[PDB]
Symmetry: C3
Subunit: 106 residues, 3 copies
């Protein structure tokens, strides 16, 4: 999928997690975020189309999705230990990672 | 190890997992797959030797191993909860990720 | 942070883990290592400054941090099951991955 669709998947599943009522809903949404995050990592964002494909900005951009994916996995660890409300709080904390990339490249 | 060796390791351990009799055999084989997947990520496949090293195809290629490593990890989570049959089924499902890359770059 | 700050973080938290007294201290230190590992992945090490940004050495370098992050996570799994001493042993074993990269690019 393209970058925008992957971002909407990220945003949609954050709101699913917030409203989720059991561990299985959280874990399924988190899996969809991780998939979207890895798929977004294949893209060139519009503000970096003029840079080299392995410029430090494109590397930083791509590693940003590794960091997002690992943080998502931390939340997944909380959810499958049954710590649903802790997992939902960790999901909401992902926004600091969303924001950090946006302020640089969005 | 070179790309072909890593691919044989991936294929060999898929069959070890299929025939495994306990969680420890599944976990050990999945670990060897993840290692092989990350090692394969360092290579240039023959069909992409003419593209630039960070072309969209080489990025798609490299991220394909991230996707495979995470999917392997999902199976390891099943095997660590002692859900051996589920872990074996998830390992069989990895083939859709194997295939998807092959049809583009093999 | 820059590359050498991330390396000091990696080295400091290895010593924290060696001296840790409970799972929480191991888990917290491992997570600082993973973060530092992914951040170091964004850098160009002095010995590769003259190489192409996606040369096979820079790819090998960056994948070295994926391998390090996954090995850290393996130790994190041990510590999350309360196997504190096994987690500490695995953290010591990380040094073979530290060394392997240093001998090539440090
Ligand atoms: C891309 C992201 C890939 C993923 C994921 C997997 N494979 Fe693969 N494979 C890929 C390429 C580009 C090649 C060509 C290698 C060459 O130099 O010819 C291959 C090759 C194989 C082979 C045959 C290797 C040989 O005998 O010479 C096998 C058996 C194989 N791949 C298996 C395999 C499996 C089981 C995977 C998932 C678990 C898998 N591959 C992932 C690219 C990619
Ligand atoms: C590559 C894939 C590496 C891995 C994995 C690890 N390190 Fe590293 N390290 C690497 C380089 C290229 C450098 C040179 C940095 C420079 O700017 O000169 C380093 C450096 C260090 C240092 C010294 C840093 C300093 O004090 O200036 C230390 C203490 C260090 N590295 C430790 C370390 C540990 C403990 C690792 C594993 C847990 C590790 N490194 C991994 C490249 C790579
Ligand atoms: C970089 C490493 C990013 C991370 C991590 C996240 N996002 Fe992002 N996002 C990024 C870019 C470069 C763009 C611009 C895309 C474009 O083509 O214009 C975006 C965009 C979005 C959007 C808007 C998409 C749209 O509706 O057109 C949303 C809603 C969005 N991003 C949300 C989002 C969330 C919730 C993230 C993590 C929790 C996140 N993004 C991570 C770059 C990066
Ligand atoms: Ca896509
Ligand atoms: Ca839009
Ligand atoms: Ca609800
Ligand atoms: Ca190799
Ligand atoms: Ca058997
Ligand atoms: Ca677990
Ligand atoms: Ca940094
Ligand atoms: Ca120093
Ligand atoms: Ca110094
Ligand atoms: Cl996850
Ligand atoms: Cl790259
Ligand atoms: Cl990468
Ligand atoms: Cl794994
Ligand atoms: Cl971890
Ligand atoms: Mn895990």
């Amino acid at each position: 999928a393209d970058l925008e669709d992957n971002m909407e998947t990220l945003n949609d599943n954050l709101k699913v997690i917030e409203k989720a009522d059991n561990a299985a809903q959280v874990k399924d949404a988190l899996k969809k975020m991780r998939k979207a995050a890895l798929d977004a990592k294949k893209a060139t964002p519009p503000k970096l189309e003029d840079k080299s494909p392995a410029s430090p900005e494109m590397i930083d951009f791509r590693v940003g999705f590794d960091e997002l994916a690992w943080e998502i996995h931390d939340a997944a660890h909380l959810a499958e230990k049954g710590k649903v409300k802790e997992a939902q709080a960790a999901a909401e904390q992902l926004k600091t990672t969303c924001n950090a990339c946006h302020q640089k490249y969005r």
